[PDB]
Structure formats: C-alpha cells, structure tokens
Design a protein around this nucleic acid. Structure first.
Ligand SMILES: [K+]
Ligand SMILES: [K+]
Ligand SMILES: [K+]
Ligand SMILES: [K+]
Ligand SMILES: [K+]
Ligand SMILES: [K+]
Ligand SMILES: [K+]
Ligand SMILES: [Mg+2]
Ligand SMILES: [Mg+2]
Ligand SMILES: [Mg+2]
Ligand SMILES: [Mg+2]
Ligand SMILES: [Mg+2]
Ligand SMILES: [Mg+2]
Ligand SMILES: [Mg+2]
Ligand SMILES: [Mg+2]
Ligand SMILES: [Mg+2]
Ligand SMILES: [Mg+2]
Ligand SMILES: [Mg+2]
Ligand SMILES: [Mg+2]
Ligand SMILES: [Mg+2]
Ligand SMILES: [Mg+2]
Ligand SMILES: [Mg+2]
Ligand SMILES: [Mg+2]
Ligand SMILES: [Mg+2]
Ligand SMILES: [Mg+2]
Ligand SMILES: [Mg+2]
Ligand SMILES: [Mg+2]
Ligand SMILES: [Mg+2]
Ligand SMILES: [Mg+2]
Ligand SMILES: [Mg+2]
Lengths: 239, 142, 62, 201, 127, 46
RNA sequence: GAUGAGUAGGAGGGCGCGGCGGUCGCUGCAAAACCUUGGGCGCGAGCCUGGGCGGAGCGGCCGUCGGUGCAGAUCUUGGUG
RNA sequence: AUUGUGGAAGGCAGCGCGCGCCUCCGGCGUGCUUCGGCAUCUGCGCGCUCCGGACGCUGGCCUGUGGGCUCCCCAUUCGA
RNA sequence: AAUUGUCGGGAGGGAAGCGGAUGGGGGCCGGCGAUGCGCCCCGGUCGGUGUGGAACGGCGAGCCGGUCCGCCGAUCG
C-alpha cells in the first residue's frame, strides 16, 4: 500500500525532528532565561537611578556643610572625559597623528570616552589644538550610547538595537544591558577598559550652530582644549 | 553518464555543444542550456541534462496536443537508444499533472525538480492550446 | 577623510582556491569545503588550505 | 464584568498604575484562591488543484504591523463652522460645515439657495475654518453618507428635494444673524496689501 | 507576458561619456578614452570639464541590463533558439538577429506568439 | 559528525520611540510614569 | 561590517581585430562593408537592433595563435582646405 | 522638509480584556515601604501598540493638441 | 572622411566649441499603456471506479507505479 519510503529519506527525517526537538528546547530555555534577565536589568536600572540622585544630593550637602563651618570642600577630580576631534586629517605632524590613533579619533568630529590618569592626561596635552574635551554629565552619556552607540563585535560595528549585543561581548564582565554599560562608563568601574573599548568611536555630526574658532584655545575664545562641564553644551549640538 | 555526475559537471560546465552564451563574459553575460532533458534550460548542475543520471524531459509529442513525459533509466546509462522511458500523455491537464507528480516526486526520482516539471508541463500544455486555435489574449494585464 | 591605511583594507594575499584546473582536485576542494564548514574541525580546515597550495608548497615525502 | 478601564493612560502607551498595583486590581489574588492557590491554565485555540503552475516562485510581501488611523479633524472646524473653499470650481465661496464623513472628508452646504453650493464633500486640506458659527442643531443629515456621493447628465429630482429639506432648516438659523446671509453669498478674495499669514479667520 | 521585475529602474546617468576634445578634432572619435596627459585638466578633474566614467556610476544590480519594457534581451537566430526562452518568458524577451531573412522572421514571430515570448523587433522587414 | 544545519535591524532612536526604549531599558517606563504623576501633583497643588 | 585621491610604476578582471582546431548558426525571401535627427543596453572599452544602400558572403560560443587596437613622432603615402 | 531600501518571519518588547467579586474616573488579599509607593505575588488564553525598513484611498489619462525620451537645433543661469 | 554646392531649420554687439541644469521648437517611441480574472447556467465539444490486454518503469526473487487501448460500472469533470 503506497510507495515504500526509501531508507535515505527515513534517516534524514529522523534526524530532522531530533534537531527540531533540541532547537525547540532552546526557545523554552532561552525564554525563561530572558524573563529572569528582564527582572534583573529592571532592578539594576532602578538601583542605578537611585545612586545617581543620591550622589547629586550628596555633593550639594557636602558643599553646604563646608559653607556652614566656614571652610572649603574640594570636589573630587573628574574621572571621565569625553574627547572630540575638531581638526581634519590634513598636514598631520607624526606625533599628533600617532596619539589620535591611540585615542581612536581618526575622523573629525569623532568622539570617545577616556579615563582620567596621569598617563592619559599627558597624552591628551600633546594633541590639545586638535581636540576639545571635558566632563560629560549623565545626560550626555545616555544620549551618546542610546542614539549613536555601536558595539564592536568581532571587529565589526554593530548597532546597539538589543541588549543581546551588549551581552554577547561584555556578558562575562557582568554587563548585560545598555543601562549596565552606562553605569560602567559614568562611574569608571573596574571593567571600564573593556566596556569603553567595546564602544565604537562615536560618529558625531557637525555642530548645530557651528564653532567659534577651531584654531584658538577655548580659553582664548576658541574651541580647542579643555572646556570642563561646557563639553555637555557642545554634545547637545553635535549629537 | 557512466561516470559520476559530479565529475561530468566539472567537464561540461565550461564548454559543451548545448551551451548558449551571449553578450560576452562580463556583467551582460547570459547563459542558457538547450539539451532536451533540461526543464528550465538553465546551465546549472541542478538542471543539467548531461551531469545527472535521473533527468526529466517534458516536450510536445508529435500531434494532437500530446505531451511526452520521459525519464532517464538508471540502469541504461550506457545505452542511449534505450535510456529514455517515454510516456505519451493525451488527457486533461489535471490527469497529466498527477502523472508528472507521480513519476518525479512520489517515487523519489527527482523531488527537487517537481516544481520545474509542473511548470514545464504547464508551459508546454498552454503552447499546444494556442497552436491549435491561435493567440486570443495578450496576457499583459497585472 | 578617515585616517586609515589603504582605506582600512587588507594588503595581504592568500590562496582562496587551487590554481589548478584538475577536475579531481576541485571535487576534493568541494568535499573539504563542506567538511570544514559543517564540522568546525581544525584538521579539516588545515586540509582545505593545503589543497590550494602550489607544487613547491606540497613537497614530496619519502 | 468590569465597566471601566482599569489602567488609564497618562500618555499614549503608558498606564497610570504599575504592575504591582494592577495585580491587585486585576484580582489575580482572588482568582488564585478560587482555583486551589493556582492560576488556571488554558489551552491554545485549536485545495482545488491548480490549473497552471508558474515557472517563477511567487513572492509575498512581508507583514506590516502599521494600521491606518481615521483622518483627524482640525480643531478649528466644528459643526456649524463657516468654511472657505480654496480650490476647485467653488474656490472662494463660503459654505457651512455640517459633519465629517467616515472617509474623513467634510460634508458642507452652501446653502445652495444663498450661493449655489449643494451638499458636497470637500477635502479638509483645501478649506480654511473661520471663527463664524451658525447653529445647525435643527439640521438632520443622518441620511447622508459617503455612498450618497458615489457615481454609478441630469441631476435626479430626489437629490434636489433632499437639498431643500436640509437647506430649509438652515436658512432660519442664518437669517437670525444680521448680515450673515450676505456674508455667505459673497466669495472671499485677497485685495491689495492683504497678507494671508496675518489675516484672522 | 507580465514582466517579473518590480523595482523601478534608476539610471545614475543617462548622458554618454564623450571622449575629450572629440568635438574639436574630426579624427578624434567619441568612444571613451582615458586621458593620460600630464597636464590634462580632464584627468585632474577640474570643475567645468568633461567627466570621466568610474565605478560609482554602476547601476543597481537588480535592475541592470533591463530594457524599458521590463525584460532582458536575448538574441535569437532561428525558431529552435526561441524555444530556450519558454520557461523564462516573464524575465527574458527575444530579439531577432539583424541578418535573419524576412521569411524566417515570420516563423519566429509565429512561434513566439504560441510560447508567449516577447519580441522586441517583431515588425522588422515585413513590409 | 556534522553540526545541525543553520537581516540588519533598522536602528531606531530610543530617545523618541517609546517601545524601542522599553526594549533596552524596561525601567524607563517606571521613570516615565513617576515623572508624569509627580508633575501632575505639583500642577494641581499650585 | 568597514571603506573609496593618485603621476612614475605594478597587477587583476574585461572589450575589440585577424587566423587555426572544434562546435552552434545566418544568407539572393538579400551576407560583408558603408550611411542614418530611428531605438535600446553597459560605469566604460563596446554591444544589440530599426531603416537605407549594396549584391555574395558572414557570424556566435569553447580552446588556441598573432605582422592584433593611434591624435601627436618638423611621423610615412595619398587626398583636401 | 527629504525618504520606503527589504519581501522568509505576527518574532522581540510593553500592555489590554477574560480565567474571582464590588456601589465601577474607583474599591476588595499577602510581602516590602521613604507611607507617595513597589518587577512582592505579575501564570495561561485571546487581542492591542511609538513593537524584526509604507501602506491605504481618490482622481486624471490611456491613439489625443496625450505621455515619455538617453535623440536633434536653440535660448538662458552657473561652470569652463 | 577631409573638403564643396544647393535646398530646408536655426543662431550671431571684438572668437567658437565644451561640462552641468532646465526650458522652447523639432524628431522619434504603441512591449509608448491594460482590458483580464473569479464564480454562476444555456448550449456545444472532449475525457471519466472495478476488471482485461500492449509496451515499460522506480526500489532492489519480490514489492511499488505511471502511460496507451478495450470492456463494465459511475455518472462528474
Ligand atoms: K566558426
Ligand atoms: K544603427
Ligand atoms: K579567436
Ligand atoms: K514623512
Ligand atoms: K495615458
Ligand atoms: K549653457
Ligand atoms: K549640406
Ligand atoms: Mg592647514
Ligand atoms: Mg565616520
Ligand atoms: Mg540653521
Ligand atoms: Mg568660522
Ligand atoms: Mg595653522
Ligand atoms: Mg569616505
Ligand atoms: Mg591608496
Ligand atoms: Mg548609458
Ligand atoms: Mg603636473
Ligand atoms: Mg540592416
Ligand atoms: Mg583609487
Ligand atoms: Mg572576428
Ligand atoms: Mg550626422
Ligand atoms: Mg563579436
Ligand atoms: Mg598574419
Ligand atoms: Mg603593429
Ligand atoms: Mg591619424
Ligand atoms: Mg599619444
Ligand atoms: Mg605632419
Ligand atoms: Mg603630405
Ligand atoms: Mg592649397
Ligand atoms: Mg520596498
Ligand atoms: Mg562629407
């Protein structure tokens, strides 16, 4: 009754369901893992949000406390910098050209974060007229990572459309969501080097409203050098 | 075929009497194959009528809107005069469609060519109808 | 402009296929292209690469 | 069953109450008790041979999740509002807005007696809504719809009578406002030094 | 026959690339030649000069070589070669070769109607 | 011994598209609701 | 996923000319060449085609070969302003 | 204002209505709480949405003085 | 082909030609642009489960099939 199914077809069909069964189990296992992760990242994001507000109020309280006692409160030195290249790639002296490459600033208006230490600060001092930098606030870090954040996966530029991209590279370091990535950058945590290097250099646009004078230092009324908290004002117009 | 089909494809894929190439070897290049046992006349190992022991032939047969359904015999690869198992069909399209499905897919002869064979049968059958009566619609709508 | 070398492209050349027209060698290459891809075996990957190599890069063994 | 929505939306897509609050309001705690301390589990909701086989596999477009929404009505346009037509044969004429049809077009009347504009559909993008309002409470146009303006020349007498019935109830309201009859009988136009971006309507 | 192609054809450039100074000199033909001169302003790409063809002008691969009618051309020299397009009548259109006799064109045109194969020049030399 | 047989997502701005933001940061919904409710109380109080 | 300047220079993939070994064709119901404000294809070298002229040969494809591609040389011969 | 590239997936994410009652802009049970609240209970089924890249409707026109054009001549602004 | 006459179109305030963008006037193009499809009945035409023959096939002695002819039944396509 009916054409006899050849042995080859039966063998292939038998293995297909086994692969389908194993493949099907992944969705159930992955779905449960995903459900738990959503609660995890939700609580971490809630915890991070509380920490940011506490730090802001903690700084205000300390400054007021010093005022009441008649002394001074020296704010902690900035731990994080955001550096933007403001000059082109023409007529590059060899030393500046090398340093900008180490900072991953290969194109004008590209931007990157940089941890603050004597080694990095001295490097930055040697490319002062080619860059402008300062201290990014929480808002700036959020906008950059959320709007123009791309992850380097296997030396490829991948848009941070889902938290799976972040976990694929930084998962072993405990960073599983974009909020974890934001927290690591802002606080300069133990895994800042991996988290920051994971971020592709930000491809910012030409500033809305333009620049004053790229050839002069920000102190002289130009645009180059350290502008401290005023980098945030520039980040709004370039992001 | 008398040698493995994969070996034959390596030999005939570059040059054979049925290979039709036009417009050079640049982007404009167009390639077709015109062996009678190539359903889509495509120059590929899948549809090749030279590099496959099991091949399907569907073409008009003689007169009276008859359609020939011939399949190459697996044990007669060295006997050209008896390689084809011809079956002349002169019934409705639905009956012919079932016969093609039975001799191509149901017996696991060339299941990968079932879609091509039915389309080939559909094209051949339609042309026979037009020949008997003549063109009546331009088939340009949609 | 972008400060890269040759637009970030590789300037290295390696054999991605045999230079020979031997039909049997190409069949072996097809066989071991499949094995390397579907198994991830380091042995298969090494075998596939050595099938591309020129005569002097495949010296005889006594 | 529930008579009102449990979670009002502060903004589009965000509810007023959190998940913890909704659990109390949904009553899942009560449902759990009635089912032996467990939330009940349900079950998932449980041809002709072709006459021609195409040679090329057919391609079907991917699914698009966006669904069109009904055309919005400009805030300046309210029932009884006087509208100025900006295009077509009736360009410049002032008509009375009656209602918005299901297609999103506006149902307007001249009225036909005053300016010769009958019951007609006018696209919202080609009209300007003025600040003049004429009462249309006594006007009944429930019988009018999109199908009333659909093709299938002499105008049938049936539509002429329908125009008069709607027109008659509107003339009395118009006559109440002094100088409104003449206002609706004259077309709007731009004179020398008249700047549209400065005009108040 | 209904063409299978559905994407619109976008021509990056419709004008031809004329050889520099072919207007000035009769002996210099219009077929493109890359200028090799050291001072050539065309080679150096000064604005307001003749444009040179480069790969950037490449047409979309999905609409490349498609005629305005929506098909690709295949040149046919007899009835037998016309039958090769039976299964590609929604993609390829036939064009009878310029040197085919009027007597043999009638056979090709008649056969193409039966196979529903588009002929681009079916009215050629029949008057 | 063979292993089992095996397109780019259009990036959207989470700063504008709500659902995209919630996909990356589920807590963003709670922050949004609290800010809206907090503002409503202040407006009513004034 | 990234990326695109290029003289001298190098290399790759292609276009075109004339034979040879094969293969598939066209032609007195009109081949080659030539002409055209006909039409189309290719980034481009070029290719396909309508019409005309002409009146007897010609082309595609694979391989292989060469006295194989011109705007210049106070270039050669011929012709013409 | 510019733009719809893709044509295999109803996936991912966030919610709503049912599966328990009430006087229904809301109310009724544990845990935690800064007493405002809370991803603490928040599972299933069927649906919705800013959710793995545009869909829908209407008209005009279809041998016309129409439409299209890479072809020809010419004009004009910019370039040269 | 250079070059020349003629007829026709057009332009021209001390060069002309050329790149790019439109416009005017020409010339050219019906694969330049469709007219089908689905479901109904009127008629016409052409073929239809189970058993008999003819020439064969797929899988490997034996199972599993289609094509063509004829005969019944079935009475649709
Ligand atoms: K030959
Ligand atoms: K020509
Ligand atoms: K040759
Ligand atoms: K838009
Ligand atoms: K038309
Ligand atoms: K000009
Ligand atoms: K002349
Ligand atoms: Mg400089
Ligand atoms: Mg960049
Ligand atoms: Mg501006
Ligand atoms: Mg300036
Ligand atoms: Mg300087
Ligand atoms: Mg670039
Ligand atoms: Mg270079
Ligand atoms: Mg072109
Ligand atoms: Mg120079
Ligand atoms: Mg000719
Ligand atoms: Mg280059
Ligand atoms: Mg030749
Ligand atoms: Mg000429
Ligand atoms: Mg040739
Ligand atoms: Mg010679
Ligand atoms: Mg020579
Ligand atoms: Mg010369
Ligand atoms: Mg030279
Ligand atoms: Mg000379
Ligand atoms: Mg001389
Ligand atoms: Mg002289
Ligand atoms: Mg599309
Ligand atoms: Mg001449």
């Amino acid at each position: 009754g009916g054409v006899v199914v050849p042995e080859s077809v039966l063998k292939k069909q038998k293995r297909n369901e086994e692969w389908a069964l194993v493949k099907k189990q992944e969705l159930a296992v992955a779905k449960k893992k995903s459900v738990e992760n959503r609660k995890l990242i939700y609580n971490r994001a809630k915890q991070y949000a509380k920490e940011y507000s506490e730090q802001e109020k903690e700084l205000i309280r300390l400054k007021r406390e010093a005022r009441l006692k008649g002394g001074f409160y020296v704010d902690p030195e900035a731990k994080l910098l955001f550096i933007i290249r403001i000059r082109g790639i023409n007529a590059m002296p060899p030393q500046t050209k090398k340093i900008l490459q180490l900072l991953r600033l290969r194109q004008i208006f590209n931007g990157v974060f940089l941890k603050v230490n004597k080694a990095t600060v001295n490097m930055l001092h040697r490319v002062e007229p080619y860059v402008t930098y300062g201290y990014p606030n929480l808002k700036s870090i959020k906008e950059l990572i959320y709007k123009r954040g791309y992850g380097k996966v296997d030396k490829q530029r991948i848009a941070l459309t889902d938290n799976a991209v972040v976990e694929q590279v930084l998962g072993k370091h405990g960073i599983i969501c974009i909020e974890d990535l934001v927290h690591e950058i802002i606080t300069v945590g133990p895994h800042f080097k991996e988290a920051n290097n994971f971020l592709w250099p930000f491809q910012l646009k030409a500033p809305l409203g333009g620049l004053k004078k790229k050839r002069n230092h920000y102190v002289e009324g130009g645009d180059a050098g350290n502008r401290e908290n005023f980098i945030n004002e520039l980040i709004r117009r370039m992001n | 075929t008398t040698v493995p089909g994969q070996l034959v494809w390596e030999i005939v894929k570059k040059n054979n009497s049925f290979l039709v190439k036009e417009f050079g070897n640049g982007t404009a290049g167009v390639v077709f194959s015109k062996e009678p046992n190539n359903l889509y006349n495509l120059h590929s190992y899948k549809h090749s009528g030279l590099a496959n022991k099991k091949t399907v032939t569907i073409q008009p047969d003689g007169k009276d809107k008859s359609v020939l359904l011939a399949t190459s015999k697996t044990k007669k690869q060295n006997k050209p005069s008896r390689l084809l198992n011809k079956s002349v069909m002169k019934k409705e399209f639905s009956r012919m469609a079932k016969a093609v499905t039975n001799q191509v897919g149901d017996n696991y002869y060339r299941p990968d060519l079932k879609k091509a064979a039915l389309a080939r049968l559909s094209a051949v059958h339609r042309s026979l109808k037009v020949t008997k009566s003549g063109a009546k619609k331009r088939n340009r709508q949609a | 402009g972008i400060d890269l070398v040759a637009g970030g492209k590789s300037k290295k050349t390696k054999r991605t296929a045999p230079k020979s027209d031997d039909v049997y060698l190409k069949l072996l290459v097809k066989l071991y292209r499949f094995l390397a891809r579907r198994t991830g075996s380091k042995f298969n990957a090494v075998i596939l690469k050595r099938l591309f190599m020129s005569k002097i890069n495949k010296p005889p063994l006594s | 069953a529930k008579k009102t929505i449990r979670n009002p939306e502060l903004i589009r897509g965000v509810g007023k109450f959190s998940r913890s609050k909704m659990y109390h309001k949904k009553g899942l705690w009560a449902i759990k008790k009635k089912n032996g301390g467990k939330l009940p589990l349900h079950e998932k909701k449980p041809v002709k041979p072709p006459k021609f086989y195409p040679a090329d596999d057919v391609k079907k477009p991917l699914v698009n999740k966006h669904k069109p929404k009904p055309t919005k009505l400009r805030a300046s346009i309210t029932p009884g509002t006087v509208l100025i037509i900006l295009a077509g044969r009736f360009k410049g004429k002032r008509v009375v807005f009656l209602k918005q049809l299901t297609s999103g077009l506006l149902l307007v009347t001249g009225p036909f007696k005053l300016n010769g504009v009958p019951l007609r559909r006018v696209n919202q993008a080609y009209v300007i809504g003025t600040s003049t309002k004429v009462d249309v409470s006594g006007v009944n146009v429930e019988k009018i719809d999109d199908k009333y303006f659909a093709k299938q020349n002499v105008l049938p007498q049936e539509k002429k009578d329908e125009q008069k019935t709607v027109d008659s109830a509107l003339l009395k309201a118009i006559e109440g406002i002094p100088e409104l009859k003449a206002y609706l009988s004259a077309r709007f136009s731009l004179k020398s030094g008249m700047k549209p971006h400065e005009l108040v309507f | 026959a209904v063409p299978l192609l559905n994407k619109k054809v976008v021509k990056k450039r419709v004008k031809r690339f004329i050889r520099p100074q072919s207007d000035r000199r009769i002996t210099v033909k219009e077929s493109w030649r890359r200028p090799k001169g050291i001072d050539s302003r065309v080679r150096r790409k000064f604005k307001g000069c003749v444009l040179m063809p480069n790969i950037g002008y490449g047409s979309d691969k999905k609409t490349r070589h498609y005629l305005p009618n929506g098909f690709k051309k295949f040149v046919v020299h007899n009835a037998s070669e016309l039958e090769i397009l039976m299964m590609h009548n929604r993609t390829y259109c036939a064009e009878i070769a310029h040197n085919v006799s009027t007597r043999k064109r009638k056979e090709i045109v008649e056969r193409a109607a039966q196979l529903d194969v588009v002929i681009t020049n079916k009215l050629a030399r029949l008057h | 011994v063979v292993r089992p047989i095996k397109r780019a997502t259009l990036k959207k701005n989470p700063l504008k598209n709500l659902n995209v933001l919630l996909k990356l940061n589920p807590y963003a919904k709670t922050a949004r609701r609290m800010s809206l409710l907090a503002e409503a109380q202040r407006v009513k109080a004034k």
